[PDB]
Amino acid sequence: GGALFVHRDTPKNNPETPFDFTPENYKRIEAIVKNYPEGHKAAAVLPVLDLAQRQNGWLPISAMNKVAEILQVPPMRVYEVATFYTMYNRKPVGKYHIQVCTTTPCMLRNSDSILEAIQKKLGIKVGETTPDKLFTLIEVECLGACVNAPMVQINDNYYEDLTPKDIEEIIDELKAGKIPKPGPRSGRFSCEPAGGLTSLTEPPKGPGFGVQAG
């Protein structure tokens, strides 16, 4: 299309670029493949390729061909799966991959202020990996954590109910390397009403009430 962040092709530079799984990781992949009925075994392409991106921060095309080899599937399905889904990044990123929900009530919640504050505090524009390494900034659509005030994502974590000052706090904590507590902050610990802790306040019922007359 005309409006795109990055196109999807392999032009050059990684035909043979080395990628190898770790033996323990072969054990892991075997464990994964054991979860599907035989005669298919192609269902594991997506989880195994996930794993590839997991141990190697970004997958080169040699990783795609390699997974296709491990599962003995035509590689074009591997490339296809790699492009069609958002998780997989086919281009290298930094150690920390920053993701913000700009769409809807996060958007209604001032999250744009969060984005701008990030761009200034880090000092770079959107979509560009920072000079040196380890910080990348892209906005993603709804991540599902919503009632908690506008959320930002770092690798496998949810920072919820985020004000710009605390954004700066987190970012500098990552500059030092100490990863802050994942859970949402400024009260609201684990998705609650801030004021009342309303609805159920009572001790939960035991294994009763189930009489059923049977």
């Binding site: 299309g1 005309g2 795109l4 196109h7 999807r8 092709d9 392999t10 032009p11 095309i61 035509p74 074009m76 399905r77 490339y79 296809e80 492009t83 069609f84």
Partner: protein
């Protein structure tokens, strides 16, 4: 006995239990306009031009893959259908280049035929018109992918019949490119035939190139040599 009465415009016809809708309309002479469906290729819901209304039924059903229970009455010219066809044709013509002068299939391409004989007469939607990076493939197949309607024919053929399995789609929304992701040459026996299956001018014959034009040429029956299959 393993036959089913199903009306077409009130005209009954006896068909087999599990023949498609499009076939059932073929039997009485209706040819429902279509793209991605092809006689030799497995069914897909991509083109959406096959839509047809069945009375008493609120939604329009796709005639390609819909099996025919007993007693369906298939109204081809019902207003809802024609509106559906005009719609689908419009959305297809939304993003398409104007290549008909340069394009090789100008005397043939089914977008022009079905465009006149079905779709609406005037377009809309000014700001728009995405473009696609073209991809060289073989010496045989000249490739301009901007004209691609993304109808999945070439894929299904290469997979099932050709057996190479090297063609696919990568993308979402507006942006889906149909072809090799790694820019590999695709060449095989039977590969050239793909230029007949591409319904639009996306794929065409490289050596035949620009030389000719369909209406000007005189077709002549013949046989083949160089292969004992006759």
């Amino acid at each position: 006995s393993n036959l089913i009465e199903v009306f077409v415009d009130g005209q009954s016809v006896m068909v087999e239990p599990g023949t498609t809708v499009l076939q059932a309309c073929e039997k009485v002479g209706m040819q429902i306009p279509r793209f991605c469906y092809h006689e030799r290729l497995s069914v897909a819901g991509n083109c959406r031009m096959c839509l047809v209304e069945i009375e008493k039924a609120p939604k329009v059903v796709a005639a390609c893959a819909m099996p025919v229970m007993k007693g369906w009455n298939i109204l081809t010219n019902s207003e809802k259908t024609k509106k559906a066809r005009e719609g689908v044709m419009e959305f297809l013509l939304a993003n398409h280049p104007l290549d008909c002068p340069i394009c090789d299939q100008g005397g043939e391409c089914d977008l022009q035929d079905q465009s006149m004989m079905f779709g609406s007469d005037r377009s809309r939607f000014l700001e728009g018109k995405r473009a696609v990076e073209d991809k060289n493939i073989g010496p045989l197949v000249k490739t301009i992918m901007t004209r691609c309607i993304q109808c999945t024919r070439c894929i299904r053929f290469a997979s099932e019949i050709a057996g190479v399995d090297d063609l696919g789609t990568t993308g979402r929304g507006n942006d889906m490119q149909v072809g090799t992701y790694i820019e590999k040459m695709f060449m095989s026996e039977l590969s050239g035939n793909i230029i007949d299956i591409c319904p639009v001018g996306a794929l065409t014959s490289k050596p035949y190139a620009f030389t000719a034009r369909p209406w000007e040429t005189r077709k002549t029956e013949s046989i083949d040599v160089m292969d004992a299959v006759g």
